[PDB]
Design a protein around this ligand. Structure first.
Ligand SMILES: Nc1nc2c(ncn2[C@@H]2O[C@@H]3COP(=O)(O)O[C@H]4[C@@H](O)[C@H](n5cnc6c(=O)[nH]c(N)nc65)O[C@@H]4COP(=O)(O)O[C@H]3[C@H]2O)c(=O)[nH]1
Ligand SMILES: [Ca+2]
Ligand SMILES: [Ca+2]
Lengths: 159, 159
């Protein structure tokens, strides 16, 4: 249907779902010191602006949240899973800025005059519609699988 | 625009492009024994059928091509890059079955009667249209950046 929905579907199937299954099946995510955090949950961060350099955007968010990388395998997966994590008060949070959101910039290209400015109300509307579709798809798939209470999706503007 | 185009754009920006830049900037990909292969190129494999278990599909293709995993960092990237590789006659091939293609199944859901069979001519047409858009987008972006000669995109049916 909409590109933003399909990007949420691959992000869910190939990242969020196996992360949730690891949390459930492993009894949590393990830190460097060997502590396993049964109470592991996921915060998915939607940025206020979407840049054409999501790698630098990721780095700036990692610095701001003071996260560190942990890694785990999910059986059958082609590659390991890497997560940015914060540990507070006996709880672990995966804090993910999805690199898949770069696809939204590709989509929107055709929807704007190509003299467009990123700060305009028109542009804020079109981007927010794509984010709304992405968020709904992510939540729909998580709810269907029973992982609603493991995942929250937060817009940067609302922090 | 089309979901399949947007999936190609994220696959290109967040995987194919940094792989190409590593090959160019590093003077190739390095094997376990320390041999660096200046002649490193990418074969992107489009499957004949798209399953709802791309992880098992990836494993079956890895077994058939007899590839092994190599890993490298690309400066600024949130995570390392993992590639399946084959080495033959002084040349290295990245052989990638893109897990992003799972998104095409999500897209197509609405386009078929939901009593549909995967083997029908109708279904072969709709899937092939999505693959055609994915391939064109990948090639367009690679050509724009100058990486056309590093990448070939092969349909499994044509091997
Ligand atoms: N934090 C975290 N997020 C993850 C991880 N794996 C997947 N994701 C997230 O899930 C999205 C979809 O991944 P995909 O469908 O496998 O689709 C992927 C996959 O086909 C390919 N790709 C990305 N990284 C690699 C890699 O290291 N090796 C290979 N062979 N392909 C990769 O590029 C596509 C697009 O990737 P993105 O735009 O980055 O979009 C990714 C990213 O936002 C992970 O280990 N950690
Ligand atoms: Ca939730
Ligand atoms: Ca080519």
């Amino acid at each position: 249907g909409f590109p933003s929905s399909t990007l949420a579907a691959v992000y869910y199937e190939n990242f969020v779902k196996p992360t949730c299954l690891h949390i459930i099946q492993n009894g949590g995510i393990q830190d460097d010191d060997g502590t396993k955090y049964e109470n592991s949950t996921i915060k998915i961060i939607i940025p206020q602006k979407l840049t054409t350099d999501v790698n630098s955007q990721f780095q700036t968010l990692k610095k701001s949240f003071q996260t560190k990388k942990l890694t785990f395998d999910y059986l059958g997966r082609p590659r390991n899973i890497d997560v940015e994590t914060l540990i507070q008060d006996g709880k672990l949070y995966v804090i993910d800025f999805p690199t898949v959101l770069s696809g939204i910039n590709y989509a929107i290209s055709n929807l704007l005059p190509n003299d467009f400015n990123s700060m305009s109300d028109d542009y804020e509307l079109i981007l927010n519609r794509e984010f709304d579709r992405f968020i709904y798809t992510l939540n729909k798939l998580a709810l269907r699988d029973g992982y609603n209470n493991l995942i929250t999706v937060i817009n940067e503007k609302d922090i």
